[PDB]
RNA sequence: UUUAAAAAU
RNA sequence: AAUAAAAAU
């Protein structure tokens, strides 16, 4: 019930299939393993965090918390989002 | 419900769990992935070993500590707090 | 569109109201005395020439009840809206047909005359859905899904 | 006979918020072209004894009506919340009420400029991004990570005075 | 700054111009004067406060004045003061409520307010607040009035950097003053004292000492095939005796009425009936103008009711017929109409109506005379 | 040949205080008649390389001269106090410097209206007193009980903007 | 009269005391530059030099007599002299304060750029100055405006 | 070296000769005892306070203290001042 | 120096004294008027009897406590009645 | 309300009137634009800031701009920014010093300030602050310039609520611009670039391409029968090429100089000597204008040191003769004068002066020619 | 003529 | 034409 993601640096995450369904690329791909050529470990963690947040508040329309971002990581986070169409 | 992140041996897992759930249920949840008995597994928080009998409330952690954008970070051990990558 | 309406009614939290038992209070003439407050409440309810206000404690939502003559013209009402006290000893029942975010809904409530407070709940409407204009319904349904992000060229 | 009644969800605000809304709408309608085409009906152009002002935003073939009310029944004892606001959506003879958040969402779909389609690839290439989104009220929803990252990289313009958003108009500072 | 000893001519002329509907006058100037209770003496204090109308409630000229006045009040604890305001804009709603609170707290100050324009005079909440602050005679008495030529000239004399010279009123000072007085009377729901009504409403054929014409008016609206009153629109007004600074030519009460009818922004798509009660019948010019106005505006109906028929030089018969051809019904008050006017337009203090001798006979005589006048042409 | 010098006492002040002094003096000279008769000589009307202005106050036969100075190195390291003030009292060729407080006292002896000789008589009669001392800085010394009692009985007028006073001009801020 | 005034009144915010004084020219420039410019100003006599009391606001300014021009011969003529001491410079300045003629005498240590200053009564020029002007000033400083009006 | 003052209400004060010398009436009158027909005891206390105040600060012209007064006492204090020619 | 007020039996004395002056010097000062030996007389502050040997510093009172416009208040006794002032 | 996206036409026409001496312009309007290094592209941000001159220092538009910029700069540390100010009044002394400090802390901000008028340009302390902010190259460059037709038009196009109307220059725009340009050149102590001096100042008998007159000046004052220099009065200026937007007939350097002299406020009771060094002799019209100016201003003596004789149609000889007769002393530049000009009015960077070929011979020949012209009549 | 009013500053 | 500038608001 979990999809395994391998960071380009050689780290491992696992995220529920429903969470990964939000990403078009992973949804099309899903085999139970995925390898990301360019996404670093921290960017994979951040996109997993985005999945977590969106799933938590996908349907709620009241008092949506903030999603912290940092300028230094924003560029590659946007690159990863584009690649994943998230 | 609160989200949690468990990291060990450069392996990471993300999950959601109830507030009142005890550490035994946490070990049960991670068992379905790591396929080992809950008994030997021991958790860690702030590099402090968590005994077999533990609960969230007793630990002092609250729903505010664990958030979708800021889950509680707890290590794991079997019978190393690896930092995340950098730019 | 009826199955989609039902699915959204059941699953999507659309307003501050959560489609559950919500306590409400009568807001009219608060600074006036309690006896005067309920006397005017009953007099307006019987006469029907004044507007009646109810506020939910936990939110800013209000139900403001306007006489139908104030609006410019009479509107066709396939359903019936009513506000009466006779059904109970001292309880007034309120029925309010509405259209919330494109889904037709019935807001039901009761108020105790003695304490000038009560409760309200929200229920799906099935009969009127077919009556409503399917053109406007589908156009609204399409419109409430589109996103301005990257929409244009 | 039994009385015929009409019911409406009347948001509740203080008078100062309504006056600020009116001022902002007028300014952005006449002095600035950002709200051109909006219609502002004065208090004497409605027979309703309680309507204070109607603002009509033509959403293409449809319409969105924001109505302020005077002397409402709330009669708050402090008087701090004696007036009110309401939002409605019209198309020919259809009529429905809308959320304040959904109201601005539907507003931003037409009028205020937002990030164009090419803004994703511009960030990839590093090319200057333009035009930028100036109406954050139109994206209160949980947007895609692409949009959020783009917004973080390049911050929105903060026009002065602020553009009119129903969300700001209809909120409860008293209880919060 | 906020306080100033006086103000320049330019700002005075730009801000105190009293057109009922002005934009761009976003500042409020409050020229205040304080005097000791009773006999006339030079003011113990007088200055000017400034404030934007959009600034926070604490920075408004009235709130600033009272904040200063509270501390100024703890030097002579046992003295009672009179305070006079000359303010370009009428106090806001919040300022009105807070002034009512402060004046109730301390019953040892008299407050008189003179206002150039009426800020948001069409707001129901503002009307309620003004009634609370000023209407009560038992409660806090805070008088409010419109500024006329005299008030503006005094403000020029004592609150302007006018190098010694004369005040030149702008174009339409009296017209604007009468419009604002009528509007304010409607808002505060003024009413005639019994003596004036008694001495002016009598139907005796022969009278003496009544050369000023009174009038009362009330609007009504078609809805559901029924007449529905508008408690908003009710009031009485008289004619202006010619004066140098006012209309050089005497302004008739009917003419003021006609000038004010447009202001109510009566909707064209609807139908209204305006019921007017007059002690004297309209004169020739007044009837001509009334008929012209009625003809031009086809969405309004008139209902005139006269107490004493006025026929001085015979010109009135032509005017009555022009009114009739216009479409304005004309009649004479019977006992019922007299009592209705007494109970609707007088501060009777709950007292009953006291008809005078030979009311019915004289009323029937007047009805016969009017019928004879109208049937024949 | 030994060098010659002129020696003056220069109370160091900051720019804003001198600016305000100039503004108040001009206002009360032109806008109001209270300071009518004062002469204000500009910066270009004096050959002195350092002078910045001069205020001449005719005290009967004698005269009082308040001077301000530019570009002195005397000012503090922070350079807050780059400017300075000085007061002289000249009669034909004779001259003598004056203390700021004594300068204010001398000023009050001529120009601003003060309590009349009948002020006390009217005070003990309970009737009105016209006019009243509008200049408090001119009575820096502790005076007769008559003045303290009468002033306690009736508050002095507060002119707006404040009347110009040397004591306020030369007051020491930081080194209190 | 003048002597009694000087001894009694402690007039003019200065009490004829040995007070700390310091040179303040060019506080921003470094110590050596300050000393060099102070020495040059003292010798050449074409610039201005200021001596400030440490804990107060008063300061004594020396401007070249040329700037104000219109020279007036002064008895006990002011001087800034370095001849008396190798390491110190002496300052003497006649003045008239609040109707009494005085001398200000001080000294500055060129190494520390500070020192002491004091005030001393002057007996000579007091009788030389015009009797009329001093009498008029004495009258003026005695009166009070209160209740003076008619 | 001390002059005696008698309060009309039945109270006694004493103040040095020099302090009283500031007052014209007492200066001309002064016998080593003074009786005042109208001045209450509190007013006598206030006037003695004024005497000491001015004797302390008659000469100093630097950082003079404020001399407290209250409006309710003002009229009687003024009457006492005018009587004493202070 | 400070200024002081001493009240006893509706008799009051106004005088100045040095800061360090001990109570013995105060008794000497009041001796010239009361014609009584210093030893038996006892002072009072806030209804607290003062020992024969007392000094300002030990007492804690300072020049700030006593002003010409508000001198230190002290009672006195012979061998206590804090009489307040009259009223309007 | 402090920030505005645009200002109204009355505001622009009232606050940006560039007369060197204006009162009642108590507000400082600061339009600004922020750009990045690289190809020209639309500004990242562009708005307006407001504030009285007498308000607290923290509210002046310059401090507000820098407070906003500090936070707005967090996003991109690596980025290097260009700032352009269009300010009605030039910054104050305290603001000038704090701006110097701010730019000193951040070496990645290049600031240009376009001023309509110069504020307190006669204050020595302000002059020192301006020199520290601008003249000193060790501190980060903060360029300052006066606004011309181009800058006013750019503002009117981008910082005003214009409805596609066209910019309408006021009466004396170019005159005031040139006065302010000369004053700012005086205050900032600009110097001639060596190439311009070498090309324009050669005294060779025949030359080609030089159609512009350069005029350096310096004033001196009588004191104790001695000439004391006014270091504040020292600078140079060139002629204005004819332009449709500026002067239709471009002004000669002499006319600009004579227009500036009245703004030095030279004292009437003293005596001044004004020495001018030129590359060309005055023309006929310039000669008459200078002669009239000298005749009317008896407290000014004029000395001219020319490099070459400008003769055309024979009127130049008459012009020189009348100029000499009016009282002015005319002579020719020799080696000493050339070296003095080089060391005074040129940015020599410590380098020495290199006399050109035939300098002495040409100087002697021109001296003989001038003697003949001035003696023959 | 017009301003329904922070439509500006 | 004049404003040396908080002489204004
Ligand atoms: Zn957008
Ligand atoms: Zn107000
Ligand atoms: Zn008439
Ligand atoms: Zn006085
Ligand atoms: Zn500034
Ligand atoms: Zn020429």
UniProtKB/TrEMBL annotation, chains D, F:
Chief location category: host cell
Keyword tRNA processing attached: no
Motif (BC-box-like motif): 144-153
Residue span of motif HCCH motif: 108-139
GO cellular component: host cell cytoplasm; host cell plasma membrane; membrane; virion component
Residues modified to Phosphothreonine: 96, 155
Region of interest (Membrane association), ranges: 171-172
Induction section of the entry: Expressed late during infection in a Rev-dependent manner.
Location of the region described as Multimerization in the Swiss-Prot/TrEMBL record: 151-164
Topology class, membrane: Peripheral membrane protein
Site positions for Cleavage in virion (by viral protease): 150-151
Region (Interaction with host APOBEC3G): 40-44
Origin: domain of life: Viruses
Record-level Gene Ontology MF annotations: RNA binding
Interaction with host APOBEC3F: region residues: 14-17, 74-79
Swiss-Prot/TrEMBL keywords: Host cell membrane, Host cytoplasm, Host membrane, Host-virus interaction, Membrane, Phosphoprotein, RNA-binding, Ubl conjugation, Ubl conjugation pathway, Virion
Region (Interaction with host APOBEC3F and APOBEC3G): 54-72
Record's subcellular location: Host cell membrane; Host cytoplasm; Virion
Region: RNA-binding, residue numbers: 75-114
Residues with Phosphoserine modification: 144, 165
Role noted for this protein: Counteracts the innate antiviral activity of host APOBEC3F and APOBEC3G. Forms a complex with host APOBEC3F and APOBEC3G thus preventing the entry of these lethally hypermutating enzymes into progeny virions. Recruits an active E3 ubiquitin ligase complex composed of elongin BC, CUL5, and RBX2 to induce polyubiquitination of APOBEC3G and APOBEC3F. In turn, they are directed to the 26S proteasome for degradation. Vif interaction with APOBEC3G also blocks its cytidine deaminase activity in a proteasome-independent manner, suggesting a dual inhibitory mechanism.
Record's comment describing the protein's domains: The HCCH motif (H-x(5)-C-x(18)-C-x(5)-H) mediates the interaction with CUL5. The BC-like-box motif mediates the interaction with elongin BC complex.
Any further remark recorded for this protein: Vif-defective viruses show catastrophic failure in reverse transcription due to APOBEC-induced mutations that initiate a DNA base repair pathway and compromise the structural integrity of the ssDNA. In the absence of Vif, the virion is morphologically abnormal.
Description of how the protein assembles with itself and partners: Homomultimer; in vitro and presumably in vivo. Interacts with viral RNA and Pr55Gag precursor; these interactions mediate Vif incorporation into the virion. Interacts with the viral reverse transcriptase. Interacts with human APOBEC3F and APOBEC3G. Interacts with host UBCE7IP1 isoform 3/ZIN and possibly with SAT. Interacts with host tyrosine kinases HCK and FYN; these interactions may decrease level of phosphorylated APOBEC3G incorporation into virions. Interacts with host ABCE1; this interaction may play a role in protecting viral RNA from damage during viral assembly.
Record-stated family: Belongs to the primate lentivirus group Vif protein family.
Protein name (Swiss-Prot/TrEMBL): Virion infectivity factor
Organism: Human immunodeficiency virus type 1 (HIV-1)
């Amino acid at each position: 019930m979990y999809v395994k993601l391998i960071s380009s640096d050689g780290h491992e995450f696992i995220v529920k299939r429903e969470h990964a369904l939000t990403s078009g690329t992973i949804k099309a791909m899903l085999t139970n393993e995925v390898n990301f050529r360019e996404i670093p470990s921290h960017v994979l963690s951040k996109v997993c965090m985005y999945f977590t947040y969106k799933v938590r508040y996908t349907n709620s329309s009241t008092e949506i918390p903030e999603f912290p971002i940092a300028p230094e990581i924003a560029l590659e986070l946007l690159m990863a989002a584009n690649f994943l169409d998230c | 419900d609160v989200f949690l992140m468990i990291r060990r041996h450069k392996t990471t897992i993300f999950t959601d769990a109830k507030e009142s759930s005890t550490v035994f249920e946490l070990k049960r949840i991670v068992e379905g992935i790591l396929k080992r008995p809950p008994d030997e597994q021991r958790l860690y928080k702030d590099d402090q070993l968590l005994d077999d009998g533990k609960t969230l409330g007793e630990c002092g952690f609250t729903s505010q500590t664990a958030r979708p954008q800021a889950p509680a970070t707890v290590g794991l051990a079997f019978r190393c707090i690896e930092p995340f990558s950098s730019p | 569109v009826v199955p989609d309406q039902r699915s959204k009614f059941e699953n999507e939290e659309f307003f501050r109201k959560l489609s559950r038992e919500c306590e409400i209070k009568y807001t009219g003439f608060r600074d006036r005395p309690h006896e005067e407050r309920q006397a005017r409440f009953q007099n307006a309810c019987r006469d029907g020439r004044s507007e009646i206000a109810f506020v939910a404690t936990g939110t800013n939502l209000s139900l403001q009840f306007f006489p139908a003559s104030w609006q410019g013209e009479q509107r066709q009402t396939p359903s019936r809206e009513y506000v009466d006290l006779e059904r109970e000893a001292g309880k007034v029942y309120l029925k309010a047909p509405m259209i919330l975010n494109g889904v037709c809904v019935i807001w039901k409530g009761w108020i105790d005359l003695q304490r000038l407070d009560g409760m309200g709940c929200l229920e799906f409407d099935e009969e009127r859905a077919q009556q409503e204009d399917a053109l406007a319904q589908q156009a609204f349904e399409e419109a409430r899904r589109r996103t301005r992000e990257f929409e244009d060229r | 006979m039994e009385n015929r009644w009409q019911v409406m969800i009347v948001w509740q605000v203080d008078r100062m918020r309504i006056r600020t809304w009116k001022s902002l709408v007028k300014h952005h309608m006449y002095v600035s072209g950002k709200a051109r085409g909006w219609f502002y009906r004065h208090h004497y152009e409605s027979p309703h004894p309680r309507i204070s002002s109607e603002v009509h935003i033509p959403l293409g073939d449809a319409r969105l009506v924001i109505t302020t009310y005077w002397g409402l029944h709330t009669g708050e004892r402090d008087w701090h919340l004696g007036q009110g606001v309401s939002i409605e959506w019209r198309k020919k003879r259809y009529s429905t009420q809308v959320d304040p958040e959904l109201a601005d969402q539907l507003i931003h779909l037409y009028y205020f400029d937002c990030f164009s389609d090419s803004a994703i690839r511009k960030a990839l290439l590093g090319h200057i991004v333009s035009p930028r989104c100036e109406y954050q009220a139109g994206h209160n929803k949980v947007g895609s990570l692409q949009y959020l990252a783009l917004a973080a990289l390049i911050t929105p313009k903060k026009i002065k005075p602020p553009l009119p958003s129903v969300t700001k108009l209809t909120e409860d500072r008293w209880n919060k | 700054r906020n306080t100033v000893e006086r103000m320049y001519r330019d700002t005075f002329s730009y801000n105190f111009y009293n057109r009922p509907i002005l934009s761009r006058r976003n500042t409020v100037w409050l020229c205040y004067e304080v005097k000791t209770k009773g006999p006339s003496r030079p003011p113990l204090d007088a200055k000017i406060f400034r404030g934007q109308v959009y600034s926070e409630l604490k920075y408004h000229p009235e709130m600033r004045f009272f904040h200063w006045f509270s501390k100024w009040r703890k030097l002579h604890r046992d003295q009672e003061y009179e305070v006079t305001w000359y303010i370009s804009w009428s106090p806001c709603t919040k300022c009105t409520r807070d002034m009512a609170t402060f004046l109730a707290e301390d019953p040892k100050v008299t407050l008189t307010i003179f206002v150039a324009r009426l800020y948001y005079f069409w707001d129901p909440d503002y009307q309620e607040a003004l009634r609370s602050l000023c209407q009560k005679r038992d409660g806090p008495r805070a008088t409010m009035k419109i500024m006329n030529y005299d008030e503006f000239q005094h403000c020029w004399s004592k609150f302007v950097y006018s190098q010694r010279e004369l005040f030149e009123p702008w174009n339409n000072l009296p017209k604007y003053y009468i419009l604002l007085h009528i509007m304010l009377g409607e808002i505060l729901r003024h009413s005639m004292d019994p003596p004036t009504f008694t001495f002016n409403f009598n139907n005796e054929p022969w009278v003496r000492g009544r050369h000023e014409t009174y009038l009362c008016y009330e609007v009504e609206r078609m809805h559901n095939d029924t007449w529905v009153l508008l408690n908003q629109r009710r009031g009485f007004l008289c004619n202006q005796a010619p004066h140098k600074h006012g209309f050089l030519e005497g302004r008739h009460a009917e003419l003021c009425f006609l000038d004010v009818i447009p202001f109510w922004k009566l909707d064209l798509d609807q139908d209204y009936r305006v019921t007017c009660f007059t002690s004297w019948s309209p004169c020739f010019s007044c009837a001509q103008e009334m008929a012209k106005f009625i003809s031009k505006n086809k969405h309004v109906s008139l209902c005139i009711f006269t107490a004493r028929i006025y026929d001085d030089q015979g010109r009135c018969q032509e005017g009555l017929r022009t009114l009739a051809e216009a479409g304005a019904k004309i009649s004479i008050m019977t006992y019922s109409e007299f009592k209705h006017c007494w109970d609707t337009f007088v501060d009777h203090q709950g007292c009953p109506f006291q008809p005078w001798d030979g009311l019915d006979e004289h009323s029937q005589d007047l009805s016969g005379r009017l019928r004879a006048i109208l049937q024949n042409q």
